[PDB]
């Protein structure tokens, strides 16, 4: 896979030059920020086609990734965002939302914070978005054929890929060798809190009555295909 | 203040290896087949004496003592189930297939069926025993993720402003920093080059977050089967740490 070949400069150029957009809101609260999610969806394939090595792997390992990873994507990004903006989430420029309009608002703001406090860089932003898309979904697919254990393996490989990438970066900012691992570690355990928060999110979507509005395998597929 | 971030690496992994708990037995001879009641009943009964000498090991980890006790029992509630999951996936990593809950209870992906929903999180902590099985992780490099747990699943949810809370949340990212450089000491010493030992990192730690998945799915479940009474409470788990 060209994915493997990539130095880590072109890592980064090609995940910079994958990033969606900001999208705006069309403008109930619940209304438009489901309308916003749609169409940041559309958006999250046509990127995550753009990941180097994604589409290296079959069309339903590629779903079970995104099936994994959507609302996680949806969320660094929102935290992302939302960094130079404390005690707000940036949903869309034209939908900024304080604490006071709660438990995983609390979540998404600490992790902004955390952002804001590690100076996180957007090359290590767009580096652990595709850490996300590849890793959440990874140690759960339920074929043991040879495939499976090969596609299994080149995700690993990616992984390994965007970690030198991330240390390059790193190394490059002029990060000594300890500072680098460390900061690596901060980053990654990050990951942990976000996943944390997606599959709180997850619950209270339920909770609300909106199980309808999680993207189907089905759904997925379709637009993988599209 | 506090010794702890002036540990070296090799008295952080001495320290860590000293604290490691009992392995438990579960309740002898219960009635066999189960039934989805009964299984319930021995992890509980399992989970909840684990808990006592998980407490125990917490209060050996360096930094945690530290820290307030309201904030030891926070990272404690946060963790406690991934601290229990991570237990079992290194007991059951040299029985392939089978889930090790104690030496006296192994259990086949086929009994996870005998209570509803619960096969599906059966089948993720196999897949992790596998994985810690292919990457041939050491004793000591799980003694450090073990810990990394303990200090990190609660450490961004301490929502406090103020200057006890910012010192709070400095001190366990320096002890966590201190386990990082122990982890990677490990992986030098054992001879990796430079570049495997990121790779290794990195690999362990992603490894964390589906630990935090199954915790989330496994909790969902607890609470769908009407098991919100098995979930220690800040009081218990308070009364525990100052006992
Ligand atoms: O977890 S919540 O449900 C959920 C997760 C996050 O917020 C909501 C959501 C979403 C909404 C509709 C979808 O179809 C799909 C995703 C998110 C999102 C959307 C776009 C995006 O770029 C990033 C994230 N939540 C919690 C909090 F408020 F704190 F954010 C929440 C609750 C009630 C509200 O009234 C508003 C939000
Ligand atoms: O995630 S589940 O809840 C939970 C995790 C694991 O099994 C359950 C449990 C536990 C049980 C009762 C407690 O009070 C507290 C913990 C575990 C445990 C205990 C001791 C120990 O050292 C390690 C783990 N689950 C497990 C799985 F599905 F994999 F079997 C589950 C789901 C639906 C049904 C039945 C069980």
Request: glycine share 4%; proline share 3%.
């Amino acid at each position: 896979s060209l994915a493997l070949s990539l130095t880590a400069d072109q890592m980064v150029s090609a995940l910079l030059d994958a990033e969606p957009p900001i999208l705006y809101s069309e403008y109930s609260m619940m209304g438009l920020l489901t309308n916003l999610a749609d169409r940041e969806l559309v958006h999250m394939i046509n990127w995550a086609k753009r990941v180097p090595g994604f589409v290296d792997l079959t069309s339903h390992d590629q779903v079970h990734l995104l099936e994994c990873a959507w609302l996680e994507i949806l969320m660094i990004g929102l935290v992302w965002r939302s960094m130079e903006h404390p005690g707000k989430l940036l949903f869309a420029p034209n939908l900024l939302l304080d604490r006071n309009q709660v438990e995983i608002f609390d979540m998404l703001l600490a992790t902004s914070s955390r952002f804001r406090m590690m100076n996180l860089q957007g090359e290590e932003f767009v580096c652990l978005k595709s850490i996300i898309l590849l890793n959440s979904g990874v140690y759960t697919f339920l074929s043991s054929t040879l495939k499976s254990l090969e596609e299994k393996d080149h995700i690993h490989r990616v992984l390994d890929k965007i970690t030198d990438t991330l240390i390059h970066l790193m190394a490059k900012a002029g990060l000594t060798l300890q500072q680098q691992h460390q900061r690596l570690a901060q980053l990654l355990l990050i990951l942990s809190h976000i996943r944390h928060m997606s599959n709180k999110g997850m619950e209270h979507l339920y909770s609300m009555k909106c199980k309808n509005v999680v993207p189907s395998y089905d759904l997925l597929l379709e637009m993988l295909d599209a």
